Each structure stands twice: as C-alpha cells, then as structure tokens.
C-alpha cells in the first residue's frame, strides 16, 4: 500500500478497449497531436502538423465545443445513421469499428452541427436584446 510505484497505459494501446473504456483516457491521445533540402522537408512537415491542429481546433470551435474534450450537443440522432442501442455501442464495440460503420454519414452531421450552433447564437443574441 505504501512504497509501491504505479505506471499506466499511455498511447494508443487503449484502442482495443470498448468505446466506454476508450473514451476515459482522451488526454493521452490529445496531448500527442502537437509534439538543406532535408531542412525544407522537416519544416514542411512541422507546418503541416501545425496547420492540421489549427484546422481541427477551428472545426471544434465553429460547433461551440471550444476548449472541451467531451461536448454533447443539441442535434438529435437520426435513426437512419445507426439503429443500434446504447447497450451494443458503448459496451460491445470499439472506436475503429464505429468509425468504419458511420464513415459515410459524417459531413451531413457536421453541417447540421454548424447550422444548429448558428441558430443557437442568433437566438441567444435575440434573447439578450431584451
């Protein structure tokens, strides 16, 4: 109980775990996204990484989930995308399988999130005018 050290699973080793268990250690993956001709190639790679991080952050911010790791929204879940109940999603599936399953219904969800956030912002502005 005293005098014993402890070490924990780090990088993507938690990919085989279920979605419920895999969504419990988001920070370990999140923190690793940032950190003559050969110098040009290395600088291009670094600039590409920075640009990708900025694009992801801007996409998160546009939906209203800025500065958050888990941010649940107002858009309802259409049944045409997936008809599996929560019992068979968060305890009998992994993130890779889920991504493979819903790979063809991603852009429409992003557009719906953008429109919902814009509508919420406009409604908030209207409310604050009183």
């Amino acid at each position, epitope marked *: *109980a005293v*005098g014993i*050290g*402890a070490v924990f699973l780090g990088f993507l080793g938690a990919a085989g775990s279920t979605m419920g268990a895999a969504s419990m250690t988001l920070t*370990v993956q999140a923190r690793n996204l940032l950190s003559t001709v050969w110098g040009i190639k290395q600088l291009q790679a670094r600039v590409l990484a920075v640009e990708r991080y900025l694009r992801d952050q801007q996409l998160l911010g546009i939906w209203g989930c800025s500065g958050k790791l888990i941010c649940c929204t107002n858009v309802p879940w259409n049944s045409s995308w997936s008809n599996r109940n929560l019992s068979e999603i968060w305890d009998n599936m992994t993130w890779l399988q889920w991504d493979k399953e819903i790979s063809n219904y991603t852009q429409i969800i992003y557009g719906l999130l953008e429109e919902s956030q814009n509508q919420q912002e406009k409604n908030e502005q209207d409310l604050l005018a009183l």
Partner: antibody
Amino acid sequence: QVQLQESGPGLVKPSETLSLTCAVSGVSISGNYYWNWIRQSPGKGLEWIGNIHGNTAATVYNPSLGSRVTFSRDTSKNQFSLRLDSVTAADTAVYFCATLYEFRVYMGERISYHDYWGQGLLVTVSA
Amino acid sequence: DIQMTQSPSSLSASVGDRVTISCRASQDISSDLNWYQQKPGKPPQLLIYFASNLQSGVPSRFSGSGAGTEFTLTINSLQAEDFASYFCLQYQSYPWTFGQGTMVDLKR
C-alpha cells in the same frame, strides 16, 4: 529488460562516509518509481535502509538508523546514490538496490507486477 | 515497526513432499505481504505477491494464502531446485521489515 548495477568502494574505515551508486538501464529513473536501498548481513538478515522517489525526489529512511543517510538521484546519468555517514563495524553487509511497482490501466484493473532485485555489492567497514 | 515472525526456523523435506511455512505480524497488514525465495549466492526471487497471486513464470506448485496477521506459503510438490531460504516481506507501513527466514533443504 531492466538491469540494476551497484558500484562503490569495497572497503571503508570507521566513522567515514560510505557512498554507493546504483545505475539503472532499461527504464528512466525520473518516472513514478520508488528506488529502494536494502542490505543483508549475517545475523541480522535483510534490513531495508530506505527509498527515494524519482519524480519528486521524496525520500524516506529507516527510523532506526536515523539521519546518518542521504539519498540522491541523477537523471542525466540515470542513477541513484546512497551516502551513509559515520560507518561502523555493524554496517558491513551486502547492499542491494531494487524497485517494486505495478503496471495497471488508468482508473481500472491491474496488468502486472515488477521487481528486479539487482545483484548487489559487498561492503566491509574496517580501518 | 511491524515485526514479521516466520515459523519453522528450519525444516527438512523430500522431493514431492508438501511444505508449509507460516508468517505472522504484530498488527494487521491487510494483504500487503510478499513471499520470496533466495538460493545461496543469488538474490531474492519473488514467489507470491499480495499473498494470493502467483508471479508470472514461477512454477504452479508454489502458493500463498491467509490475510490479516496470519499468512502461509505452501509448496505442493517440492523439487531439487526448491531448496532455499524463503522470506515474507511486509510493505503496508514504513519501514519495510523482513522475516528471519525459513530454510528448506533436501531430506536424506
């Protein structure tokens, strides 16, 4: 595999300072590990001297031996050293440097347990 | 300091015999006890951790049981390489304390 190697003088005189250094290979010493110094002598058996924390440099020592010990850690060389002051004849022993810890998942179940118990070094106190 | 007392001090057994050794504490230590083996001229080697779990790679004959202030190490089928000095180490409260040890040698 993690390996621990003890080093230091094989002989020391009474009332002098005894300095030993355990070097670690295969795992960084600055992690959340408690590096422990133990000794074994005939008649007394195994006797735990103390331990030091790699990350925070926190140290705990045996109350019986008191303030005569100081533990240090060097991250650049990946080593930890023990300095026992005012040696006597009773301090002649074989010194072991070791570490005991567990590998688990973040807020979940355990996976494995680890100890190494390096080969150790003989030290004798005499003028 | 918590005192660790082993019994018997020394015992003799033959290959395949069942060997039992008891380790007791002055005060309760929950399940924070470990059983180690030590041969002449070699460092201690872990046999049982947390008083009921077998270390990976150790033969299945070795086993540990008990709790609180009473723990037991059992070897079901002693072998030629099993003759050594066995120790119980407690790590619930500082300082760590070892038992006096129990020596098991070939019976002839």
